[PDB]
Design a protein around this ligand. Structure first.
Ligand code: CLA
Ligand code: CLA
Ligand code: CLA
Ligand code: CLA
Ligand code: CLA
Ligand code: CLA
Ligand SMILES: CCCCCCCCCCCCCCCCCC(=O)OC[C@H](CO[C@@H]1O[C@H](CO)[C@H](O)[C@H](O)[C@H]1O)OC(=O)CCCCCCCCCCCCCCCCC
Ligand SMILES: CC(=O)O[C@H]1CC(C)(C)C(=C=C/C(C)=C/C=C/C(C)=C/C=C/C=C(C)/C=C/C=C(C)/C=C/[C@@]23O[C@]2(C)C[C@@H](O)CC3(C)C)[C@](C)(O)C1
Ligand code: KC1
Ligand code: KC1
Ligand SMILES: CC1=C(C#C/C(C)=C/C=C/C(C)=C/C=C/C=C(C)/C=C/C=C(C)/C=C/[C@@]23O[C@]2(C)C[C@@H](O)CC3(C)C)C(C)(C)C[C@H](O)C1
Lengths: 98, 161, 185, 177, 159
């Protein structure tokens, strides 16, 4: 997806594949690590202007799913309730109306 | 280069040189320069007469500095009274016209033709359109000679007339 | 034989092999009477850093070549103004102390040199090979033949090395003397 | 014959994220490689927003320094103190509320564009007035917007710094340095 | 290069030292381009030397914040300390915008800087006569301007 044009090659052909890219970047070696957070570490063969984003990949759907977690829901509601109590106390102090 | 637009009476293919060697671009360039002055000289001549007889002189020109549009000395003396900020705005605006609207010099376009729905003329076909074109050309060179005559008369004596 | 960075860059990167030459076949060793492969501490044996070292040597020589010319010219002409007059900054060396910090002159020089360096920094680390080390495409008076290109490359290095040493004496002699361009007592 | 060399910095190859974008493949200026580390769409959105903000802010500073004011005695302050005086006056909070709702809509635009839910160009909000019909005309108009935005960004930076350094209205011509 | 203009009539190929007797079209391209540009600059410089003395001193003030008007400043070597250095910086920066830009060229011709101040392409031997005339005028200007500057160093200024 994000490496639609990388000429990604396997360790077995480190010095065999030379066709560079749609750019002129040399082929990159893909190492299949067993870590789930880093399933594949890509190694370069030379100087290259490769676009490797440092930003994460978030989406609205799973951010909303995280905010739909019971902690976030029951923290937002209780925060709003406490804030409403504080605002009522500021606006109607000493419960004079009672 | 002897039967294109400028074939009036009292002269035809007016030479002193500067027309031989058969360069289509130069005629396309010089005639554009010829018309570009004519469209200027006509306004330049009119701007030299109308604020003398009509004398509209409306409102104020530079409210911060006064400089009422009535006290401005007509003619060459005007470039000194109108604020240089105003003169710069005139040049900058006409640059916008010269490079963005009504003067985008599209090469396929004719010698002096571009988007001209904003006044001027937007006619079609030929014949009367060509006679009108010769009318524009003929008036421009009349104005071109006239305006420099206005300038020479102005700077020499004391004022426009 | 000065491949353009456009193509030369296709063989850039940290080379993991050895040319077998003195310093990966780099200019600067050929002396007058013959070869003068100098490195006595064996820094060039770390072949992976030879393109880096050449870049540092060129960068230092280029700064020193201007810097030495720097200490000469203020002693004979100064920028038209009072802040740079011969009475406000008598000797050239008392300029980093006078024109600096809140003053403005040196601070602006620091920023714009920083901007250039931060922009031309990707060439120093990436795109830097044993072939395009110090080459910033500014090849105007460069000869075309290979052997004459080596002479100009050798000429810059010898001048840069000389200025590096010459500037060292320039500030040291000036500071111990407080005297004009010929810093002799 | 090799890398697509950047036109701005001739000794650095052009970043691949600068291909086919406005500005970009006429100068290709990115020596530090920010486009190599961040999404080009987000960078372009930020650049266009900054350009528009600066084009408004520069003209606002010009108008305020030259003496243009709203018909209220509360506005008889210098441009330097305009921010603090109007923050204490109230309108800055209201301006922030309005820019907040507009930026909520802009944030929705960014979220729905980056996720691909819509087909929005980075800085496009739909406003199509004085926009050329021809595709090359649109490209060069976007070029003009970018150039004017960058010029206004640098110009406003200089205007603010010079105005703070030397208490003086916008032209700064008299000054003393 | 025995046909690339410059050989008008009073003398033919004027290469005594043979500085272009090798065939380096690249070096000659650099040499001719620098020759033409120097002719152009000397042409403006010599015109800039004669006029402010003879007439035409510009009306207003060069530096109103310092009172300095165009009349006050001297004409010739010596004005380099009266025109403010900020003005000299602007002169350098503008000419930069016209030399490395507006007139930056490559793979086109000797000194065909494209824009220029109107884009205009001529034809015929008339181009050859005019272009050779420009080289001849530039050569005269280059000799003249160093003469004016060198003399003023050892004659003061004016008559
Ligand atoms: C439903 C509950 C509730 C209600 C009705 C209000 C209502 C109000 N708050 Mg408030 N507030 C709340 C919860 C609430 N807040 C909570 C949970 C916090 C977290 C600490 C705050 C923190 C807060 C601050 C720090 C300030 C206000 C202020 C205000 C007043 C101006 C509106 C504003 O700034 O929005 C408040 C913004 C939010 C609620 C968004 C929080 C994220 C307004 C009367 C301002 C004020 O007094 O105006 C002069 C002010 O300075 N509130
Ligand atoms: C004795 C001084 C000296 C010499 C001989 C050179 C020689 C060279 N430099 Mg260099 N340089 C110098 C000082 C010098 N430099 C200084 C002080 C700086 C700092 C501003 C630079 C900055 C510089 C850059 C940024 C680049 C060069 C490059 C080059 C090479 C090609 C350019 C050329 O031939 O024109 C120089 C010949 C002259 C006669 C000019 C001397 C003017 C006095 C060439 C080997 C280019 C390169 O490496 O391409 C291979 C390149 O990109 N130089
Ligand atoms: C808020 C400031 C800002 C931002 C985010 C951008 C963003 C961008 N500019 Mg840009 N630019 C700006 C101000 C800015 N510009 C100004 C003031 C100028 C005038 C000098 C320019 C002149 C300019 C040129 C000439 C070019 C760009 C280009 C670009 C794009 C690629 C550059 C890059 O990697 O990111 C740049 C990231 C930053 C500037 C962040 C600031 C870093 C500091 C901490 C990117 C969309 C290139 C382009 O159009 O390609 C798409 C290009 O060729 N810019
Ligand atoms: C296109 C942008 C632009 C332009 C035309 C100028 C133009 C000028 N600047 Mg300026 N400047 C700029 C951007 C710009 N600057 C930026 C981005 C900064 C940094 C924020 C500065 C900081 C700056 C300072 C600090 C000073 C100037 C000064 C000057 C004037 C000399 C001149 C009119 C000087 C001036 O006006 O003298 C009072 C001056 O002292 N500028
Ligand atoms: C920067 C100035 C400059 C440059 C680059 C050139 C370049 C060129 N000229 Mg040229 N020329 C010049 C000035 C210049 N000229 C002047 C001022 C005159 C008038 C005398 C001429 C008259 C002239 C003729 C009549 C002809 C040329 C020709 C040529 C071309 C081939 C000859 C050659 O190799 O010259 C290379 C250029 C040089 C070696 C210039 C070096 C000059 C040194 C630096 C100084 C010379 C003495 C100087 C006055 C000393 C100053 C004193 C001070 C230091 C104390 C070449 C492109 C020929 C041509 O068209 O070829 C097809 C040709 O027929 N030129
Ligand atoms: C290489 C070209 C060159 C250079 C460096 C200069 C440099 C200078 N000229 Mg000058 N000038 C030039 C060509 C040049 N001139 C030409 C071709 C003409 C004929 C139109 C003039 C006519 C001229 C006049 C009439 C005056 C100057 C003046 C000046 C001085 C003040 C700056 C100024 O306002 O210039 C303005 C230059 C231009 C607008 C260029 C057109 C400065 C030393 C002033 C002065 O006192 O002279 C010492 C002055 O009053 N110039
Ligand atoms: C105020 C908050 C402002 C900070 C956030 C502003 C940037 C948010 C980034 C954004 O919206 O796009 C970043 C993401 C779009 O991210 C998209 O995610 C996709 C996942 O399938 C793919 O990874 C796409 O490549 C990626 O572009 O937008 C979000 O949905 C952000 C949610 C809100 C985050 C808070
Ligand atoms: C106190 C007092 O009483 O004194 C009076 C005096 C006075 C004179 C009366 C005044 C006046 C009035 C004025 C305003 C007089 C103005 C005169 C003008 C505008 C002259 C402009 C000429 C432009 C030309 C020739 C452009 C020409 C363009 C050309 C030649 C192009 C030329 C080409 O060679 C080029 C460039 C390329 C070639 O291939 C082709 C060709 C076309 C030949 C004063 C100053 O107010 C005060
Ligand atoms: C729609 C945008 C616009 C604005 C907003 C605007 C504003 C001002 N113009 Mg301008 N103007 C145009 C457009 C605009 N002008 C156009 C298209 C032209 C024709 C090309 C033009 C011409 C002139 C002239 C000739 C003068 C002039 C002036 C002022 C002025 C005075 C300030 C002050 O006196 O308080 C202010 C505020 C006078 C001047 O002195 O400016 C300092 C003056 O002489 N203008
Ligand atoms: C439209 C853009 C523009 C502005 C806005 C502008 C403005 C000022 N110019 Mg400049 N200028 C150009 C463009 C602009 N100049 C161009 C294209 C050139 C051709 C090379 C040029 C030349 C000179 C010279 C030779 C001098 C000069 C100066 C001043 C000055 C005075 C400051 C003051 O009054 O203190 C101010 C305000 C004089 C000076 O004294 O600078 C300290 C002076 O020496 N300028
Ligand atoms: C910033 C600042 C200042 C400063 C400063 C700065 C920049 C000071 C810089 C000082 C600097 C740059 C000092 C270099 C010395 C280099 C030396 C000594 C090299 C010796 C090398 C020797 C002795 C041997 C050389 C050779 O063996 C070689 C290598 C090979 C042999 O074949 C040939 C020989 C034997 C000859 C001020 C202005 C001073 C005061 C201000 O307030 C604050």
């Amino acid at each position: 997806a994000e490496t639609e044009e990388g000429l990604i090659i396997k360790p077995e052909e480190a010095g065999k594949i030379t066709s560079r890219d749609k750019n002129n970047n040399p082929p990159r070696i893909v190492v299949k690590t067993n870590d789930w957070d880093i399933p594949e570490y890509q190694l370069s063969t030379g100087a290259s202007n490769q676009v490797s984003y440092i930003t994460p990949v978030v989406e609205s759907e799973d951010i909303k799913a995280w905010l739909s977690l019971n902690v976030n829901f029951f923290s937002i509601i209780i925060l709003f309730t406490v804030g409403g109590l504080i605002e009522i106390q500021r606006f109607f102090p000493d419960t004079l109306y009672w | 280069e002897s039967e294109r637009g400028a074939q009036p009476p009292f002269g035809f293919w007016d030479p002193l040189g500067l027309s031989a060697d058969g360069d289509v671009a130069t005629f396309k360039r010089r005639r554009a320069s010829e018309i570009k002055h004519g469209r200027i000289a006509m306004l330049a001549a009119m701007g030299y007469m109308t604020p003398e007889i009509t004398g509209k002189f409306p409102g104020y020109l530079s409210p911060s500095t006064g400089v009422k549009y009535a006290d401005i000395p007509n003619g060459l003396a005007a470039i000194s009274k109108v604020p240089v900020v105003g003169w710069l705005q005139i040049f900058a605006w006409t640059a916008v016209c010269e490079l963005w609207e009504d003067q985008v010099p599209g090469t396929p376009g004719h010698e002096g033709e571009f988007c001209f729905k904003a006044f001027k003329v937007t006619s079609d076909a030929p014949e009367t359109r060509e006679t009108k074109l010769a009318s524009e050309l003929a008036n421009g060179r009349l104005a071109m000679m006239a305006i420099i005559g206005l300038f020479f008369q102005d700077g020499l004596t004391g004022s426009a007339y | 034989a000065r491949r353009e960075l456009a193509v030369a860059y296709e063989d850039a990167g940290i080379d993991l092999m050895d040319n077998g030459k003195f310093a990966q076949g780099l200019v600067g060793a050929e002396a007058a009477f013959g070869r003068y492969e100098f490195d006595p501490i064996g820094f060039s044996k770390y072949t992976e850093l030879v393109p880096w070292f050449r870049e540092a040597e060129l960068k230092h020589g280029r700064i020193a070549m201007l810097a030495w010319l720097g200490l000469v010219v203020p002693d004979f002409v100064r920028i038209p103004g009072e802040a740079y007059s011969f009475e406000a900054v008598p000797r050239v060396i008392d300029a980093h102390d006078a024109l600096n910090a809140d003053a403005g002159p040196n601070f602006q020089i620091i920023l714009f040199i920083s901007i250039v360096e931060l922009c031309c920094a990707k060439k120093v680390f990436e795109w830097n090979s044993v072939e395009t080390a110090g080459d910033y495409n500014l090849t105007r008076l460069f000869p075309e033949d290979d052997e004459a290109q080596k002479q100009m490359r050798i000429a810059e290095l010898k001048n840069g090395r000389l200025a590096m040493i010459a500037f060292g004496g320039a500030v040291t002699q000036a500071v111990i003397t407080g005297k004009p361009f010929p810093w002799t007592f | 014959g090799g890398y697509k060399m950047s036109k701005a910095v001739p000794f650095l190859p052009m970043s691949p994220a600068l291909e086919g974008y406005v500005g970009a493949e006429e100068e290709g200026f990115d020596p530090m490689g920010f486009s190599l580390a961040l999404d080009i769409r987000w960078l372009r959105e930020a650049e266009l927003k900054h350009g528009r903000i600066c084009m408004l802010a520069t003209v606002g500073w010009i108008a305020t320094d030259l003496g243009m004011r709203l018909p209220g005695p509360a506005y008889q302050v210098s441009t330097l103190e305009a921010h603090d005086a109007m923050v204490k006056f109230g309108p800055m909070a209201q301006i922030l509320i309005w820019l907040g709702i507009i930026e909520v809509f802009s944030f929705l635009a960014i979220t729905n564009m980056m996720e691909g839910t819509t087909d929005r160009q980075p800085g496009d909000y739909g406003l199509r007035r004085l926009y050329p019909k021809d595709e090359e005309g649109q490209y060069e108009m976007q070029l003009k917007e970018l150039r004017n935005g960058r010029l206004a960004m640098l110009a406003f930076s200089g205007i603010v710094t010079t105005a703070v350094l030397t208490g003086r209205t916008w032209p700064f011509x008299x000054x003393x340095x | 290069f025995e046909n690339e203009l410059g050989v008008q009539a009073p003398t033919g190929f004027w290469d005594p030292l043979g500085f272009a007797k090798d065939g380096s079209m690249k070096a000659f391209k650099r040499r001719r381009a620098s020759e033409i540009k120097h002719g152009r600059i000397a042409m403006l410089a010599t015109m800039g030397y004669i006029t402010p003395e003879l007439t035409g001193k510009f009306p207003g003030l060069l530096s109103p914040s310092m009172g300095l008007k165009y009349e006050d400043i001297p004409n010739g070597l010596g004005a380099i300390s009266k025109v403010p250095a900020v003005g000299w910086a602007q002169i350098l920066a503008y000419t930069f915008y016209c030399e490395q830009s507006q007139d930056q060229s490559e793979g086109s011709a000797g000194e065909a800087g494209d824009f220029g101040k109107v884009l205009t392409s001529k034809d015929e031997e008339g181009l050859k006569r005019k272009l050779n005339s420009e080289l001849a005028n530039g050569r005269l200007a280059m000799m003249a301007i160093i003469g004016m500057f060198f003399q003023d160093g050892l004659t003061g200024s004016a008559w």
